[PDB]
């Protein structure tokens, strides 16, 4: 399982000269710096995954590849069964080159030109982008916020689904950027609204294995097992820091949509991406638990630091993700900042974060801080953020 | 380098092995090793331990790619015009949707690589065929047919392989200039798919379509190292769009992030790959010389000409099919009767009846065994 190894998440790993979006690409995406912005980790991809790739390279040929037989399916479904009690048939499992690429195709297949998509806000920005790329109009449902604890406004969602032409809801479970791990009851409530109004739901569950100790993930399609218009997207891209390998799982239980998918996704997989992902499912549990423990300690430190140093900020330790969602309303008002907070923190603090502009709606005054970094790196960044805000 | 090496491809999820003991001469990847200079570039990228979000930043990749095209074909292009797809067919599917409306048509010469048609099918675009002519033994474009169809029909786009699959033609400057002129006069976009451009016989030289026809901005070029370096699995392709509007559509509507292992592998091929590639091409040439002699001596009624490019042999077996009244796919025939997997005419759209395509990017001793089995199956109960 990888429980006996001693990992070093304190390790500082150089990311210069790797064409890393994190290092090179902040200007195009957002518009000596300490990087706490785009959601990849500064932790190394685990050696059990890297070694699987090395062993595939030793086979010398990198030709046309697809997922043949049952071994990949068995590893994935074994993971979902063990961890969430969630099973699906091999025939329902298809693959995308990353979840957002998958979302773009799914939205086009499900929605006609006149149909609308619903998203709860604040939101991961590419949910909206995926609707824009398909000329599909989006309706926002603002989440209710009590000091960093967000909840779905079910009356708002019901009203919008009833009186707007909503064909599709794109949903993050667990949620980015608020970090909510939705309960069975919350998912069942939303499911009933969607079923009653023949609305499709895509459940993006890419954060589902990054969560605080004691948290349990419930797949949307586990909470609502009766409805074939729930599509599930899962990956090892976030959990194992392999977003560059662009390989994702899509579980489509609706025959019509599956057949449609299978007419445009004419296979062709990356052998290195497949062996890396399979290695995570088969061998990565011990490293992943060690990672989550270290993360929990990063969050405990951040919580203490905000309480002491930025007491007017609102922050709750999230149930999931390695992303801290911090309300800096007080400081923004006081200092009278009227440029994007991401600009402000680059210019004034030499720290890259994501601001309200990256989260679609209902994000005013917030920043998102990526803390999947060595504790010492996080401490430095926080020091610079504090210095930029205080009086 | 040892191109004779037998490399085990079982347990690698390879389409070539799993997609259909048997001799494999079908799907277009090599049984030759991806060269160590490429594999080692991937290994040193793994030593940087993080496989996060990646894009082609800076100008180092561009410098490596344009240095290759300049040295090898005297072709240069602007860094602004270079964009990327996850394989050439993924690129074509996107370009066809951007270029064509639903009542537009596309033109392909035939026989053709199947995905030219499939890329039109997926975008609900009707294809028109212009069959290549066989009258000197080498295949040639029927320019009169091309002119007629482009003038009389609503052809928006021509998808063209330079060099050609499956005939292997390396088009001359004059052939390309002539075709380009037809396309320009009729406002037809041209996608020149040049993926085979570095796999060619010693006496052949590649001219990019955009080199032959340098003052027409609706020539789109696609190049990759996937065929030449046996890295099709890494799904990373270059697309050169010289038309500002289409480039803007690509830059706007194209969602694009890259695989760091794919980028480093391709870049390494351009920077350090030339020595291995020259050696691979010399070994390939020798495979073709053996194949030509073998067909002349052992299957005289077969029609074959050494292809100017590619590692793919296009063989007319019409005589044998007619004499034996073979009524099944030639791929099924050879699987059942020879234990050899080839690609039959059914993969090449049109103008392919009676042909097979044989992949000879394999150890020479594997090729010879395969050819012997093909011959025995065809001449069984023939005088």
């Amino acid at each position: 399982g990888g429980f006996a190894v001693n990992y070093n998440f304190d390790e500082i790993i150089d990311r210069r000269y790797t064409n890393a979006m994190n290092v090179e690409g902040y200007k195009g995406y957002l518009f000596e710096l300490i990087r706490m912005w785009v959601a990849d980790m500064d932790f190394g991809t685990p050696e059990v995954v890297l070694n699987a790739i090395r062993e595939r390279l030793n086979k010398k040929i990198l030709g046309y590849t697809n997922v043949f037989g049952s071994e990949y399916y068995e590893a994935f479904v074994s993971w979902t069964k063990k961890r969430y009690g969630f099973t699906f048939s091999q025939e329902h499992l298809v693959f995308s080159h990353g979840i957002v690429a998958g979302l773009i195709e799914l939205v086009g297949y499900i929605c006609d030109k006149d149909d609308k998509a619903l998203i709860v806000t604040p939101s991961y920005g590419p949910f909206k982008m995926a609707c824009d790329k398909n000329h599909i109009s989006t309706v926002y449902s603002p989440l209710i916020n009590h000091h960093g604890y967000y909840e779905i406004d079910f009356d708002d969602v019901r009203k919008k689904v009833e009186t707007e032409n909503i064909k599709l809801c794109i949903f993050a479970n667990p949620h980015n950027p608020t970090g909510r791990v939705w309960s069975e009851e919350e998912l069942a409530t939303l499911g009933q609204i969607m079923k009653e109004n023949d609305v499709w739901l895509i459940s993006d569950e890419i954060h589902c294995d990054i969560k605080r100790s004691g948290q349990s993930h419930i797949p949307f399609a586990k909470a609502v097992p009766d409805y074939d218009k729930i599509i599930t997207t899962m990956s090892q891209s976030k959990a194992f820091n392999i977003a560059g390998l662009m390989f994702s799982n899509i579980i489509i239980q609706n025959e019509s949509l599956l057949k449609t998918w299978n007419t445009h996704h004419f296979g062709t997989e990356n052998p290195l991406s497949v062996v890396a992902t399979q290695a995570a499912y088969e061998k990565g549990e011990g490293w992943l638990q060690a990672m989550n423990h270290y993360l929990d300690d990063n969050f405990n430190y951040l919580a203490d630091f905000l309480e002491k140093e930025l007491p007017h900020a609102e922050f709750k330790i999230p149930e999931a993700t390695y992303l801290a969602w911090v309300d800096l309303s007080y400081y923004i008002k006081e200092k009278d900042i009227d440029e994007s907070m991401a600009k402000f923190f680059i210019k004034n603090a030499g720290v890259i974060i994501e601001g309200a502009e990256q989260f679609v709606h209902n994000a005013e005054g917030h920043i998102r801080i990526n803390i999947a970094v060595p504790r010492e790196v996080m401490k430095k960044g926080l020091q610079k953020i504090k210095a930029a805000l205080v009086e | 380098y040892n191109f004779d090496e037998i490399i085990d491809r079982r347990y690698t999820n390879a389409m070539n092995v799993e997609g259909y003991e048997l001799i494999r001469m079908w799907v277009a990847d090599m049984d030759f090793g991806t060269p160590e200079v490429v594999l080692n570039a991937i290994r040193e990228r793994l030593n940087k331990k993080i496989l996060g979000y990646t894009n082609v930043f800076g100008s180092e990749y561009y410098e490596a790619f344009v240095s290759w095209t300049k040295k090898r074909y005297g072709f240069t292009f602007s860094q602004e015009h270079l964009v990327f797809s996850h394989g050439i067919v993924a690129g074509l599917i996107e370009l066809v949707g951007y270029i064509c409306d639903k009542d537009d048509k596309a033109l392909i010469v035939t026989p053709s690589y199947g995905p030219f048609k499939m890329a039109c099918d997926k975008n609900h675009i009707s294809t028109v065929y212009s069959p290549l002519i066989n009258h000197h033994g080498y295949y040639e474009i029927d320019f009169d047919d091309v002119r007629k169809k482009v003038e009389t029909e609503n052809i928006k786009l021509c998808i063209f392989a330079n060099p050609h699959n499956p005939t292997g033609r390396v088009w001359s400057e004059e052939e390309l200039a002539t075709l380009g002129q037809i396309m320009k006069e009729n406002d037809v976009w041209l996608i020149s798919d040049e993926i085979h451009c570095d796999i060619k016989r010693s006496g052949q030289s590649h001219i990019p379509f955009a080199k032959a026809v340098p003052d027409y901005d609706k020539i789109i070029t696609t190049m990759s190292q996937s065929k030449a370096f046996n890295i099709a699995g890494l799904m990373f392709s270059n697309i050169i769009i010289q038309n500002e509007s289409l480039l803007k559509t690509w830059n706007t509507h194209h969602f694009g992030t890259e695989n760091p292992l794919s980028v480093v592998a391709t870049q390494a091929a351009y920077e350090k790959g030339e020595g291995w590639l020259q050696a691979m091409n010399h070994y390939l040439d020798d495979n073709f010389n053996y194949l030509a002699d073998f067909l002349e001596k052992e299957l005289p009624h077969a029609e074959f000409k050494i292809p100017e490019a590619t590692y793919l042999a296009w063989v007319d077996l019409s005589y044998y099919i007619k004499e034996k009244d073979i009524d099944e796919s030639m791929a099924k025939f050879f699987i059942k009767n020879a234990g050899v997997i080839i690609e039959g005419a059914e993969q090449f759209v049109h103008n392919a009846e009676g042909h097979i395509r044989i992949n000879i990017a394999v150890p020479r001793e594997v090729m010879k065994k395969g050819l012997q089995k093909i011959k025995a199956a065809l001449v069984e109960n023939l005088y």
């Binding site: 004419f266 296979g267 062709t268 | 799907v27 690589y113 995905p115 048609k117 499939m118 993969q347």
Partner: peptide
């Protein structure tokens, strides 16, 4: 099903 085929 190889995408080169049909």
């Amino acid at each position: 099903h190889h995408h080169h085929h049909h």
